[PDB]
A = this chain, B = another copy of it.
Amino acid sequence: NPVMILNELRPGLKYDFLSESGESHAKSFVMSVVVDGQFFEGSGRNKKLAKARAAQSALAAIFNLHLDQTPSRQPIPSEGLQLHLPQVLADAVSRLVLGKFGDLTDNFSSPHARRKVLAGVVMTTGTDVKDAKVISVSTGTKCINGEYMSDRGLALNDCHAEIISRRSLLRFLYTQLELYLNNKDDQKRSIFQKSERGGFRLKENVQFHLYISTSPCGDARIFSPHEPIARGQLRTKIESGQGTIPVRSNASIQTWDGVLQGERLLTMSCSDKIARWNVVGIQGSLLSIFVEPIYFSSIILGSLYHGDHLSRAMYQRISNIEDLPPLYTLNKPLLSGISNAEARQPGKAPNFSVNWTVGDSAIEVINATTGKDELGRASRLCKHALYCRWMRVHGKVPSHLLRSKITKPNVYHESKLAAKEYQAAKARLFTAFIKAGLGAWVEKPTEQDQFSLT
């Protein structure tokens, strides 16, 4: 018991309360203390829990670590261990995303502050942790209804927080490319550089870290948290509710006329999508035509962390992958929990998804069931908006600069097919999942991308 050990090692020490937040099941307190001058702090739904976490950080920073559970240990990154110790990096990206969300929700007082899952991307440009910069913040836990599908890219299909955070990261990447291409003097401020292999690549030591308030839905969450000590099957998000179901071993692909006749939309679980990002990269196909693949360096979970299950879901399940195109690889990012894990909130999920990217003046609210904003307009993150930004970048880069030839792009799906290497890596990933017995990836009907900007 950290409070007991700190109270006996430093008998005269006294704890200091700060301020409570939320209400009922979502309420949480923040306690602080000052032993030998350091300003230790912790948090929990009840003050005695926050008390123990503040005393825990105090005992760790002034003495040694407590009786840490083995599954709670973090599988360290396969390479690139430069952003200090993994727990300090985890707690830093976690507090940064929570604080940016508090700024975007007027100190959690706005109606959109109530949420189940919170997500965000953090960028580090150097060895020091002071250099962190929040890139995107999002919330969401629902998917578009089958009847609200857009045949011209105006509706978001998946609004789970981590998915929306990646789309916001894509908005930041388009901004950085335009930042480099709009002026010669601004090239030093961009995160990109021209690559010796053609196109662009990230500047040295630029890293993105993903934070989710809970383990990603799907395979990463199929374990019993209270009995730690097993089949990485692919799963699809179910319609009418949170949670996933394994993909059927004998199921035909989605049809556009069938999503409105009987079959519910089958979106892949977030766990499978992050493994997919660990192979083909987080930039998607269109951005690959301009830049080299980008991968997350870390995956920080605010709750439901487990090293065996999360590592099995993020990459160990598809270690049999092979013959990847050059630059592509099986990412093995740092996986870690946090010192102040969130408590479970038993209750119904919100119908709205919140999203924000650095440089935006405010958050964007989306109705996850319809894939559009509360007043029926297309989202900044929708396919059509992304393709619009991509077209803007395509009209400024010389044809020789492109990593894949694609003169006069028109229909969205064809521009995606122009990324031959990304498509090849995606094919390798699909065969890896099949060869491992985890099932075949479910793809949405092609009519979903059969649209031109015109």
* Residue ranges of A at the interface with B (Cβ–Cβ < 8 Å): 25, 116-117, 141, 146-152, 154, 214-215, 217-218, 221-227, 238-245, 250, 252-264, 269, 304, 344-349, 370, 445, 447
B-chain residues with CB within 8 Å of residue A250 when the two chains form the complex: 240
B-chain residues with CB within 8 Å of residue A264 when the two chains form the complex: 346-348
Copies in the complex: 2
Q: How far is the CA of A217 from the CA of B256 in the complex (A)?
A: 10
Residue contact B262 to A116, C-beta cutoff 8 Å: yes
Residue contact B238 to A150, C-beta cutoff 8 Å: no
B-chain residues with CB within 8 Å of residue A347 when the two chains form the complex: 240, 262, 264
Some 29 contacts from A to B, beta carbons below 8 A apart, are A25-B240, A116-B261, A116-B262, A117-B261, A146-B344, A146-B346, A147-B225, A147-B344, A148-B224, A148-B226, A154-B227, A214-B260, A214-B261, A221-B257, A221-B260, A221-B261, A238-B258, A240-B252, A240-B346, A240-B347, A242-B257, A243-B253, A243-B254, A245-B253, A260-B344, A261-B344, A262-B344, A262-B346, A262-B349
Residue contact B263 to A243, C-beta cutoff 8 Å: yes
Chain B's closest residue to A150 (CB) is B224
- CB of A121 to closest CB in B, whole Å: 21
B-chain residues with CB within 8 Å of residue A217 when the two chains form the complex: 257-258, 261
Q: How far is the CA of A241 from the CA of B347 in the complex (A)?
A: 9
Q: How far is the CA of A241 from the CA of B262 in the complex (A)?
A: 11
B-chain residues with CB within 8 Å of residue A304 when the two chains form the complex: 260-261
B-chain residues with CB within 8 Å of residue A344 when the two chains form the complex: 146-147, 260-262
B-chain residues with CB within 8 Å of residue A445 when the two chains form the complex: 243
